[PDB]
C-alpha cells in the first residue's frame, strides 16, 4: 500500500490501428455534405483527402 | 501480461477525445501518429490490449 | 499564472489536454522558456478560490 | 531499319516513366501520398518527416 513511487503498478493499454486501403470501420465524429460532379472541389473521402 | 485482453472492436463513431480527462499522469506517446490528430482519420480496425 | 498539477508538465507546444486548452497557449514556435515551481507552502489557500 | 531514331524516343519515354514511378517510393517516411503525413502527425514531426 505505502510503496515507492516507481514501485506502483501502471495499467497500460497499447491499442493500435491499421491505416490502409481496406474499408474503415472506426472513425472520428464528423459530418457529411452533398456530392458535386462537374466541379473542381476538395474531397475527404474516408480519410483520402 | 500473462493473459492479454484483445478486443477487436467493430464500426462505430467513437470520439477519441474522451479519455482526455482520465486519471492523473496520462501519457500519450504515439510513435507514428499524433494524439490531437485522432479526430478525423478513419481507422480500419483497432486492436486493444490490457 | 497559477496553473497546478501534472497539467503544468502538460503545458508545452501542442499536447492538448483537458486544462492546457483554455488556460494558456503560445504560437507554434515557443521561442522562450517556461519556469514552474511548487507553491505548496507559499500559496496554500483552502477557500481562496 | 530505323533503329537509331527509335532509341532516343524510347530513352525519352523511359526517362518520363521512371520519373513518375519514383513518386510512390517512400524515402524514409510512413507514407508516399502528400496528404497523409499532414493528416496523422503533429507539425513538429510533420516538418521533419
**C-alpha span between B28 and B39 (Å, rounded):** 15
The torsion angle over the Cα atoms of residues D1, D5, D8 and D13, rounded to 10 degrees, is -80
For testing the chain D interface, which of C12, C14, C16, C29 should be mutated: the one with the most D CBs within 10 Å? Answer: C14
Three-class DSSP category at B45: coil
Q: With helix as H, strand as E and coil as C, how does B10-31 read?
A: CCECCCCCCHHHCCCCCCCCCC
Size of the B and C interface in Cβ pairs below 8 Å: 13
Residue from A16, A20, A24, A47 to probe the interface with D (highest D Cβ count within 10 Å): A47
Q: What is the DSSP letter of B43?
A: E
C10: closest CA among B17, B20, B15, A6?
B20
DSSP label at residue A24: P
Residue C19 and residue C5 in contact, taking contact as beta carbons nearer than 8 Å: yes
Alpha carbons A10 and A16: distance in angstroms, whole number: 19
Q: What is the largest CA-CA distance in chain C?
A: 37
Q: How far apart are CA B7 and CA B11, in angstroms?
A: 13
Q: Whose grid coordinates read 524516343?
A: D9
Amino acid at each position: 500500500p505505502t510503496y515507492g513511487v516507481g514501485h506502483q503498478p501502471y495499467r497500460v493499454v497499447v491499442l493500435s490501428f491499421e491505416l490502409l486501403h481496406a474499408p474503415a470501420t472506426v472513425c472520428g465524429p464528423k459530418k457529411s455534405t452533398n456530392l458535386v460532379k462537374n466541379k473542381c472541389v476538395n474531397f475527404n473521402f474516408n480519410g483520402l483527402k | 501480461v500473462y493473459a492479454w485482453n484483445r478486443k477487436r472492436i467493430s464500426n462505430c463513431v467513437a470520439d477519441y477525445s474522451v479519455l482526455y480527462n482520465l486519471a492523473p499522469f496520462f501519457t500519450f506517446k504515439c510513435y507514428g501518429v499524433s494524439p490531437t490528430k485522432l479526430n478525423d482519420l478513419c481507422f480500419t480496425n483497432v486492436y486493444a490490449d490490457s | 499564472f497559477v496553473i497546478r498539477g501534472d497539467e503544468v508538465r502538460q503545458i508545452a507546444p501542442g499536447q492538448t489536454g483537458n486544462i492546457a486548452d483554455y488556460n494558456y497557449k503560445l504560437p507554434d514556435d515557443f521561442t522562450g522558456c517556461v519556469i514552474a515551481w511548487n507553491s505548496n507552502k507559499l500559496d496554500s489557500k483552502v477557500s481562496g478560490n | 531499319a530505323l533503329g537509331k531514331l527509335q532509341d532516343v524516343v524510347n530513352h525519352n519515354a523511359q526517362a518520363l516513366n521512371t520519373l513518375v514511378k519514383q513518386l510512390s517510393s517512400k524515402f524514409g517516411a510512413i507514407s508516399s501520398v502528400l496528404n497523409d503525413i499532414f493528416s496523422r502527425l503533429d507539425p513538429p514531426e510533420a516538418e521533419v518527416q
